[PDB]
Paper text:
Among them, kinesin-5 motors represent a unique and highly conserved subfamily that is essential for mitotic spindle assembly during metaphase and spindle elongation during anaphase. In contrast to the majority of kinesin classes, kinesin-5 motors adopt a conserved bipolar homotetrameric organization, composed of two dimeric subunits folded in an antiparallel arrangement mediated by the assembly of a 60 nm long central minifilament. Each kinesin-5 motor consists of a conserved organization including: an N-terminal motor domain, α-helical neck and bipolar assembly regions, and a C-terminal tail domain. Using biochemical methods, we show that the kinesin-5 tail domain decreases MT-stimulated ATP hydrolysis by binding and stabilizing the motor domain in its ADP or nucleotide-free states.
Model building for both the kinesin-5 AMPPNP and nucleotide-free motor domain structures revealed conformational changes in α0-helix hairpin that may regulate the affinity of the tail within the motor domain. Compared to kinesin-1, the kinesin-5 motor structure revealed the conserved kinesin fold with two longer and reorganized class-specific L6 and L8 loops which form part of the motor MT-binding interface, similar to the map of the recently-determined S. pombe and U. maydis kinesin-5 motor domain structures. The MT-bound subdomain consists of the α4-helix L11 and L12, as described for kinesin-1.
Author numbering:
A (entry chain C): 18 to 118, 125 to 243, 250 to 274, 276 to 360
B (entry chain A): 2 to 38, 49 to 278, 285 to 439
C (entry chain B): 2 to 44, 47 to 279, 285 to 360, 369 to 437
The structure:
């Protein structure tokens, strides 16, 4: 019932070596106790999580540890969701999606590995299935369907009478998939349709919340609908650090104002407020059922080990640790 | 032997109004610039005109008009007058990143024109508000550019700090946390005064139930006048600005002096009886208690007709009345400022024509108590995470707050640490 | 700094008529556009609400929009009838008639784009936009219909600008038709997510103030506008004249809003009395008193989040803050705990003409949760029978559009429950 919360540490990037930033954060894999501190190793804080991940770990390894055990539980008729969030350039987009695209061995991301891995899972049961996908990005409080051909229709988000936590979306073209080749041709267009710009922090820095959900029906009779939300959020952007002068600065407002709403959702749920303000962000309503409902959710945090970006590193770890107190309704 | 002026934000403009008015009247300058019938804060062109070495920059064009469209518009050259086009909305975030980055470059250009016009720059005085946004964001970025170009220069700050109880804006406690990292690391000397205790004097010594900003500002102006303008005239012992960083700041991160100045009588004042009031807690201009803390360093500056020889007895009476718990690190830390020139009353002011005046500067552990007043105010609003979206909107992340909050704790301990040593 | 103000709907167009009449009498500008005042400070910030014209004339930077010509023609007929330039009139025939679906979605939508052109043309000739004011109804189909869509397109074009709304809340006391509450659920459904700040006014309070303090026997409908008229001027007062703490519009928004959703406030004008004592503390007592709240709720039922005070006249904040500090202590239960200073002071130097002192109240308290509970109950009760839906169903509005209007409404109401106590 408790939400699994893991954390990954990225290696030092070029600028981290160009500014000559030393490693202040270290990990212990099996013990899952990430040790972080300031420059002078005098006082250090202790963070306990379900798992830890060093910089040399692979993409399929993190997929094997946390994501893989949740693949098999989808068929029972339960929802799952996992997303990375944190400072810009921590490596969230590469962790969830992967930079360049069969087996669960190479540096391929989580999403195309999930399609390859789950496809055999359904074929092993020999069940009747109708699997579809969904690619959308939240850019400046607007909904744009990547998978859809036209997407000119004004996409709104409505509530539902039966499903209390869920929300109804109009205009989501649920294309059926029976072969992995068909999924890869559209998904690569999705990341081709993914709005991205070049920043000094990251030349391939995400510029929108890409909530990539997966839904499949099961019929063999007790009908079941499998639901999995492979969410890829935008990172927190220190507007001075990234560097922009403009149209990009309008993007920073909506992205940064959105993450701030996310944290309060955890703040209210941990302290058990009578109600939680999901209504202030479209993003919050997308994960409203995911956060404090009938869903086994997980979170994969990424943090830079740079001594300079210690503040965003330490502050981001707060919501990660507090999330273990949040409960669900299995 | 010359220094320039910086007045940022509405606080800086209206305060300087009396400051330069004093400066203009202290030396017999007319409101036009034509001295009828020394040059430290003014340059003189051949036309018989003086110009103030000032920098008045505001992000809102509202307040500047009062000076350049009313009186004193002849004394200023619009060359110095820089003006923005939209207020920072009391947001350090918008003041620092959004708007200030687009104006700051214009300001720096006017500075190098003045610094070259002067010879042997002594430094400059900073005027802004810690509570207000304009005085928080635009100031902070401005200060950082100064230390980059002018490393070996004095940086005085007069930041009016809000009251523990009385307040004007709601987000005042948020700006103070952001400015702490800015002033402490960059600025060498900063002065914090609060209008609350300033009200206390105006309704006790002046017996005035209608004190406005103008009345409080004329008081602050007299403090700055004796600190610099008097030190441009020779006496028994003249003082400079630079020794304060060594005579008043005995360690790098120990610089937030307390200022007192209370020769305030409505229209008999002996010498020593006046000096006693400088240590009376009831007119310290900041809501704190000297008995709660201790006294680290303290230097005086005497104005007008003062004779040092019989003065030494009065200084001894401070030691003879030893109930203030003077610290052990500095036994003989008393630099005496002796200026022969007396202060002057502005016509229509609320101060009486005195023949002698004394203004005290002193660092102490009592200023650490004022931080205890603030710290709780900041933490409560941060717990519910309210009003935080505005600062995130301009792009300053919340991580700045967590980082800056520790600097408040670390600084407040450093003052507490000194008392322990014996 | 420039600000554009919009009028929409049968009621909204009437309210502004007195508004500009006050602002014109403020600076002393004759209706025709010639300036004949005596104060030079009046021309110091004329740019805020006017554009310079040929022959030294002035044009109210206004946009007059409606679905019915008769109401607007009366404005151009009476006094200040030539003050607008007729090109700003944008209207059509076949008024909606309390039909929000027709005003917002189907009919006004054809006229919407024509207004945006006049809105877009106005902004570019202006130096730099500051805020956007829209006076309209919440229960009236037309103003709420077009106005909500008007705000959606405008804010989409101008994310950096201020969306201030002076709107009239459907009063549970007096109305002509019992179908009025339906519009409110449909009105705010678009407002909160697309508005920066909102002002709430009730007719019951309107007649309440004119009856109690003014002691008038026949409260005319125009005289009620005379009350709301100056209240908007209080918000703008920091922009026109030089003051001690000139709190700009966006500055005021940041001081009140504790969270990007809860931005509904209750204005009120204190210094109004019968012919019969005029001190500065005299204003402070009337400020906190419930008899000046323009909402149909007791502010003491809930608790305050933030309170802005804008004073008009030669005043010392010492006389203010000491008087102000008592309110923090006198009613300690009335303010929340995590905000130490609930007050926001703003001292504009110049008061209005005639009076020597004045006070402008701006407060966001939890009391508004009650005002919306009035609408929600009637909305849900009439929704169960599905009565008079075919009046709206045929226009092309799905049922689920109403469904979210229910939950999203009460969520705003439930927010203040926690923040109160
Ligand atoms: N004692 C005193 N305080 C002043 C005076 N003028 C301004 N202040 C303080 O300055 C604070 C606001 O500072 P500013 O940043 O300069 O205000 P601003 O220039 O309009 O810029 P914003 O704060 O962003 O609106 C107020 O809360 C006052 O307490 C003054 O004349 N006397
Ligand atoms: N574990 C890792 N080892 C090496 N390089 C990595 C690792 N994780 C991420 N990177 C690289 O770091 C850069 C940042 O990629 P990205 O995933 O976009 O960062 P981010 O934190 O997601 N910021 P954003 O793009 O806005 O989501 C890319 O060039 C990745 O290839
Ligand atoms: N203050 C004020 N309110 C008015 C006036 N005229 C109408 N109203 C209010 O406006 C509300 C309905 O507005 P409405 O006439 O339907 O606007 P419409 O949408 O254009 O039709 C009513 O409940 C009235 O209380 C007026 O002159 N002054
Ligand atoms: Mg200000």
């Amino acid at each position: 019932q408790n939400i699994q919360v893991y954390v990954r540490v990225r290696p030092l990037n070029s600028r981290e070596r160009c500014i000559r930033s030393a490693e202040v954060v270290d990990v212990v894999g099996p013990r899952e106790v990430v040790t972080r501190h300031t420059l002078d190793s005098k006082l250090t804080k202790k963070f306990t999580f379900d798992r830890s991940f060093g910089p040399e770990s692979k993409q399929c390894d993190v997929y094997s540890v946390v994501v893989s055990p949740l693949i098999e539980e989808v068929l029972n008729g339960y929802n799952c969701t996992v997303f990375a969030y944190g400072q810009t350039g921590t490596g969230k987009t590469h962790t969830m999606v992967g930079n360049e695209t069969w087996e669960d061995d190479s540096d391929i991301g989580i999403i195309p590995r999930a399609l390859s891995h789950l496809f055999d899972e359904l074929r092993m049961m020999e069940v009747e299935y109708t699997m579809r996908i969904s690619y959308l990005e939240l850019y400046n409080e607007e909904l744009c369907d990547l998978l859809s051909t036209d997407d000119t229709t004004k996409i709104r988000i409505f509530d539902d009478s039966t499903k209390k936590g869920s929300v109804i979306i109009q205009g989501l073209e649920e294309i059926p998939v029976h072969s992995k080749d068909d999924v890869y041709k559209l998904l690569e267009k999705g990341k081709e349709r993914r709005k991205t710009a070049t920043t000094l922090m990251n030349a391939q820095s995400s510029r929108s919340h890409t909530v990539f959900s997966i839904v499949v029906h099961i019929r063999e009779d007790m009908l079941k609908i499998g639901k999995l939300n492979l969410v890829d959020l935008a990172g927190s952007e220190n507007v001075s650090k990234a560097g922009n002068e403009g149209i990009r600065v309008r993007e920073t407002v909506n992205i940064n104002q959105s993450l701030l709403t996310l944290g309060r959702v955890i703040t209210a749920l941990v302290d058990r407020a009578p109600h939680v303000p999901y209504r202030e962000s479209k993003l919050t309503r997308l994960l409203q059922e995911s956060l404090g409902g009938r869903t086994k959710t997980s979170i994969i945090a990424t943090i830079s080990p740079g001594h300079k970006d210690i503040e965003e590193t330490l502050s981001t770890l707060e919501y990660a640790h507090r999330a273990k107190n949040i409960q669900n309704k299995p | 032997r010359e220094c320039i002026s910086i007045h940022v934000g509405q606080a800086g403009v209206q305060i300087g109004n009396a400051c330069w008015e004093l400066y203009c009247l202290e030396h017999g300058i007319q409101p036009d610039g034509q001295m009828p019938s020394f040059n430290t804060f003014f340059s003189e062109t051949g036309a018989g005109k003086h110009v103030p070495r000032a920098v008045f920059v505001d992000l809102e064009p509202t307040v500047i008009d009062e000076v350049r469209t009313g009186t004193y518009r002849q004394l200023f050259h619009p060359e110095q007058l820089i003006t923005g086009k939209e207020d920072a909305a009391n947001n350090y975030a918008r003041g620092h990143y959004t708007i200030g980055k687009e104006i700051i470059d214009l300001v720096l250009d006017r500075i190098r024109k003045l610094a070259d016009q002067c010879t042997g720059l002594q430094g400059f005085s900073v005027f802004h508000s810690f509570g207000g946004g304009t005085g928080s964001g635009f100031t902070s970025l401005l200060m950082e550019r100064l230390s980059v170009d002018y490393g070996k220069k004095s940086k005085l700050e007069f930041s009016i700090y809000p009251a523990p109880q009385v307040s004007t804006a709601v987000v005042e406690p948020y700006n103070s946390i952001l400015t702490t990292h800015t002033t402490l690391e960059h600025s060498d000397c900063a002065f914090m005064v609060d209008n609350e205790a300033i009200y206390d004097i105006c309704r006790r010594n002046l017996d005035i139930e209608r004190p406005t900003y103008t009345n409080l500002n004329r008081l602050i102006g007299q403090i700055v006048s004796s600190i610099t303008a008097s030190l441009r005239f020779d006496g028994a012992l003249n003082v400079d600005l630079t020794e304060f960083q060594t005579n008043l700041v005995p360690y790098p991160r120990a610089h937030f002096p307390l200022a007192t100045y209370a020769p305030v009588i409505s229209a008999q004042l002996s010498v020593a009886e006046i000096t006693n009031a400088c240590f009376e807690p009831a007119n310290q201009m900041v809501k704190c208690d000297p008995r709660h803390g201790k006294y680290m360093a303290c230097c005086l500056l005497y104005r007008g007709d003062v004779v040092p020889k019989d003065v030494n007895a009065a200084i001894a009476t401070i030691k003879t009345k030893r109930t203030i718990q003077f610290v052990d690190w500095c036994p003989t830390g008393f630099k005496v400022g002796i200026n022969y020139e007396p202060p002057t009353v502005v016509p229509g002011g609320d101060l009486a024509k005195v023949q002698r005046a004394v203004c005290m500067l002193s660092n102490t552990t009592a200023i650490a108590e004022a931080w205890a007043r603030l710290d709780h105010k900041f933490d409560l609003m941060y717990a519910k995470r309210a009003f935080v979206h505005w600062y995130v909107g301009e792009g300053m992340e919340e991580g700045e707050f967590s980082e800056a909050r520790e600097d408040m704790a670390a600084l407040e301990k450093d003052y507490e640490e000194v008392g322990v040593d014996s | 700094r420039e600000i554009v103000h919009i009028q929409a709907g049968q009621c909204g167009n009437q309210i502004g008529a007195k508004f500009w009449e006050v602002i014109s009498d403020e600076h002393g500008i004759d209706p025709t556009g010639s300036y004949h005042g005596d104060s030079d400070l009046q021309l110091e910030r004329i740019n805020v609400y006017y554009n310079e014209a040929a022959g030294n004339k002035y044009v109210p930077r206004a946009i007059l929009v409606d679905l019915e010509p008769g109401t607007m023609d009366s404005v151009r007929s009476g006094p200040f009838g030539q003050i607008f330039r007729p090109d700003n009139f944008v209207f059509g025939q076949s008024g909606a008639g309390n039909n929000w679906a027709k005003g917002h979605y189907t009919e006004g939508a054809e006229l919407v784009d024509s207004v945006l052109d006049v809105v877009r043309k106005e902004s570019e000739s202006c130096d730099c936009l500051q805020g956007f004011q829209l006076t309209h109804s919440l229960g009236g189909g037309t103003g709420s219909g077009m106005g909500t869509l008007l705000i959606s397109k405008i804010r989409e074009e101008y994310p950096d600008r201020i969306m201030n709304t002076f709107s009239v809340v459907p009063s549970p006391k007096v109305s002509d038709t019992v179908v009025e509450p339906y519009n409110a659920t449909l009105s705010v459904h678009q407002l909160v997510e697309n508005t920066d700040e909102t002002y709430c006014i009730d007719n019951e309070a309107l007649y309440d103030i004119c009856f109690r303090t003014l002691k008038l026997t026949t409260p005319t409908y125009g005289d009620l506008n005379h009350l709301v008229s100056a209240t908007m001027s209080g918000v703008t007062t920091c922009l026109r004249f030089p003051g001690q703490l000139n709190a700009d519009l966006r500055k005021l928004a940041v001081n009140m809003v504790p969270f990007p959703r809860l931005h509904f406030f209750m204005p009120g004008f204190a210094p109004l009395t019968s012919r019969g004592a005029l001190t500065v503390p005299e204003l402070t007592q009337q400020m906190f008193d419930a008899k000046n709240m323009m909402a149909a709720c007791d502010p003491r039922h809930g608790r305050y989040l933030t309170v802005a005070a804008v004073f008009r006249g030669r005043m010392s904040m010492k006389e203010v803050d000491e008087q102000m500090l008592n309110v923090q202590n006198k009613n300690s239960s009335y303010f929340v705990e995590w905000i130490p200073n609930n007050v926001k002071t703003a001292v504009c130097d110049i008061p209005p003409r005639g009076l020597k002192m004045s006070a402008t109240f701006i407060g966001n308290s939890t009391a508004i949760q009650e005002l919306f509970k009035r609408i929600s109950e009637q909305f849900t009760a009439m929704f169960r029978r599905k009565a008079f839906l075919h009046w709206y169903t045929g226009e092309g509005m799905d049922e689920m559009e109403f469904t979210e209007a229910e939950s999203n409404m009460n969520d705003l109401v439930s927010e203040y429950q926690q923040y109160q106590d």
